Design a protein around this ligand. Structure first.
Ligand SMILES: Cc1cc(-n2cc(C(=O)N3CCOCC3)c3ccc(N[C@@H](C)c4ccc(F)cn4)nc32)n[nH]1
Length: 277
């Protein structure tokens, strides 16, 4: 991997200074841990019962995440490969994953989130995606499940937190030239971000709600697109549909998406819109 970089360059942190407090999620388990005054981290694990391709998949991920340097991308604190099971030390973000956060902070009788908060989450991810595109990296799995938040209160920062699909399928998140032709460019991530925008403004709904995979395949290929989420404003939905243009030569880059997300923030008719319950 190059971004130029070898396993040489990672920070090998000894297993003696690592222990795992609690489990967080699961391919392969992921826990919360401590290191060293104590440092709080997230620990991704390679199960010791594994094959050869699993090994060069696990480290692959380690060098890729370690080569990034961006505030909207999960930091790699350290690495523990010389002790079985091999670890990847990652930035711990107390806000949890994005899909859970929106479904759990969904307003209910209360005034949990306003629309300005979700525009910030979308721009946080859009700025991280701009960093990937500028450095010619294609993610291939821009979804709400792979996004994390530093904290739950105001001032939260969203960050892309996983690179599982970027090894070297999420039908509902991929453009036609992806699932039918196997082509992947920076415009493939533009389509997925548009689906992510829909996840954000629907507050965690599953895209194409009652459609299975092949239904989405034939629906998207024939020109069909999703309806706006409940109470979604005009300028926001137009960003989703511009991301879902059939020809990738007409979808916008992440510099243009960032500008349009900025303008909706500068629109009182957008940020004063009430979220449903
Ligand atoms: C790399 C990383 C993960 C992470 N993390 C923080 C959780 C959390 O809920 N916390 C609240 C209580 O305090 C502790 C923090 C959390 C929950 C599930 C999870 N699942 C894994 C598979 C995952 C990985 C990447 C991704 F984008 C989504 N999910 N990861 C979680 N922080 N940093």
């Amino acid at each position: 991997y190059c971004f130029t970089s070898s396993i040489s360059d990672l920070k090998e942190v000894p297993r003696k200074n690592i222990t795992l407090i609690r489990g967080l999620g699961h391919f392969g388990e992921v826990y919360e841990g401590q290191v060293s005054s104590p440092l709080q981290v997230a620990v991704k694990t390679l199960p010791e019962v594994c094959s050869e391709q699993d090994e060069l998949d696990f480290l692959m991920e380690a060098l890729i995440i370690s080569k990034f340097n961006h505030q909207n991308i999960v930091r790699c604190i350290g690495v523990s490969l010389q002790s079985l099971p091999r670890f990847i030390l990652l930035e711990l973000m107390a806000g949890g994953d994005l899909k859970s956060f929106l479904r759990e902070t969904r307003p209910r009788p209360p005034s949990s989130l306003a629309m300005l908060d979700l525009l910030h989450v979308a721009r946080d991810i859009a700025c991280g995606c701009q960093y990937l595109e500028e450095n010619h990296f294609i993610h291939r799995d821009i979804a709400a499940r792979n996004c994390l938040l530093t904290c739950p209160g105001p001032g939260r920062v969203a960050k892309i937190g996983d690179f599982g699909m970027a090894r070297d399928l999420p039908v509902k998140w991929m453009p036609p030239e992806a699932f039918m032709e196997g082509i992947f460019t920076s415009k493939t991530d533009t389509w997925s971000f548009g689906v992510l925008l829909w996840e954000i403004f629907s507050l965690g709904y599953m895209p194409y709600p009652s459609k299975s995979n092949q239904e989405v395949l034939e629906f998207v290929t024939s020109g069909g697109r999703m309806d706006p989420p409940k109470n979604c404003p005009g300028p926001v939905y137009r960003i989703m549909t511009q991301c879902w243009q059939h020809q990738p030569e007409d979808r916008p880059n992440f510099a243009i998406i960032l500008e349009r997300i900025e303008y909706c923030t500068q629109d009182p008719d957008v940020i004063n819109t009430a979220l449903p319950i």
